[PDB]
Every structure is written in C-alpha cells, then in structure tokens.
C-alpha cells in the first residue's frame, strides 16, 4: 500500500494544487476519512535501545534495535510482541526471555504518561513497522499502511492513509484537518500543504527503496 499512496501523492502533486486561480482547500475536507490511529509522542533512543512511541489511544510501543516490537495496550496489562519476521505473540505484563524488553517498555511507558505533548490531544493495534529521521522530519510507517511525517521546525504533521486515500494535516497552530487527496487535485490547496505533499513523495520513495 506504499505503492498506492505513491500513486495518490503523484496524482495530486502532478496537478500543482497551489498553482490554481482561487484555491479552495475547504471543499476537500472529509471528516469521515479522519484516521483512527496516529503517533502522538515519540522518543528516539536508537543509540541504545530503539524508538519508543505512544499512539493516540494512549497505548505505547517500542521498535527495538533488533527490529522486534513490544506493544502495550491502553488497559496497561495486555501485551503484543512482534518478532523480526513479523510473528505476533499475545502476552500479559503479569515469558522470561522478554524481561529485558518489558523493563524497557516500562521506561517508555513512564515517559509517555508524564513528559511530552500529545499530538492531536483534542480529538476522540497497528504497530510501528519502521521509521527514520531526516534533517527536517521524522517519518513513521505503521503496519496499517499509514505514514506519518512530523516536521521539527514548525510542528506541522502529515498523516497519510492509503486506504481512505486521505491526508490529515496538522498545522503550526495545531488545526487538525483531514482531506480526500483526490479532491485536493480538484480544488487546490495552499503552498504549505502542497510543499509537504511533495516532501511526502520523496519520503515514501525512500520507504519503498
């Protein structure tokens, strides 16, 4: 579904959506397309352990440096462990081979409950497949096909879902708006969103590379 979101981004970037006489972004908004999940907080500790993150439902997960993952549901007890090959195991916090990974999940659980800003905090199962950082953004790929790109300098964020063929844009003032990508070609959009959609394309290419 990376290839699907590639064709979706190419289709809108090819229409030059900011280069229109009278742009009308608002006609492309579709609340029904709003994503169920996104990343609300993250901590890059990949020099030692991996990357820890929270999802908007307050569940937490870690993508460990050995490409395994541990996910703790928002009931604080139910666990999922994901091996490198993708094998999924259902655990509870309460096997012994994972005691080291669980005690690191706890560090990240403690961190997320107390420390960072919740992206999308106003608004009311997948795991981090992979991620990377560039000089200007962190790029997060979830197992449900969503791709999230957070931009460091101005805190804007894109959430791309290839299933709804939609993009959610969170701007610097934290305005959360979701758009059908097909309708962005029709009605156009501002230069700031069109720039980030061009960036997303180079980032999905890299995800595909």
């Amino acid at each position: 579904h990376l290839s699907d979101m590639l064709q979706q981004l190419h289709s809108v970037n090819a229409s030059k959506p900011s280069e229109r006489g009278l742009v009308r972004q608002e006609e492309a908004e579709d609340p029904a397309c709003i994503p169920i999940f996104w990343v609300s907080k993250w901590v890059d500790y990949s020099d030692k352990y991996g990357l820890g993150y929270q999802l908007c439902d307050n569940s937490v997960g870690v993508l460990f440096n050995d490409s395994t993952r541990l996910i703790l549901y928002n009931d604080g007890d139910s666990l999922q462990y994901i091996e490198r090959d993708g094998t999924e195991s259902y655990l509870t916090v309460s096997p012994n081979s994972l005691m080291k990974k669980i005690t690191l999940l706890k560090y990240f659980r403690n961190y997320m409950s107390e420390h960072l800003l919740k992206a999308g905090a106003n608004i009311t199962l997948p795991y981090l497949r992979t991620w990377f950082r560039t000089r200007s953004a962190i790029i997060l790929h979830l197992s449900n096909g969503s791709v999230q790109i957070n931009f460091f300098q101005d805190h804007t964020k894109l959430i791309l879902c290839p299933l709804m063929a939609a993009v959610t844009y969170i701007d610097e003032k934290r305005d959360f708006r979701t758009y059908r990508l097909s309708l962005l070609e029709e009605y156009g959009c501002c230069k700031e969103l069109a720039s980030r959609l061009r960036y997303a394309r180079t980032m999905v290419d890299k995800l595909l590379s």
């Binding site: 990343v39 609300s40 907080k41 901590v43 890059d44 990949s46 960072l116 800003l117 957070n150």
Partner: peptide
C-alpha cells in the same frame, strides 16, 4: 537521541 514536542 531526540524526542517529540515537549
């Protein structure tokens, strides 16, 4: 290291 917004 690095972290999301504080």
């Amino acid at each position: 290291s690095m972290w999301s917004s504080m």
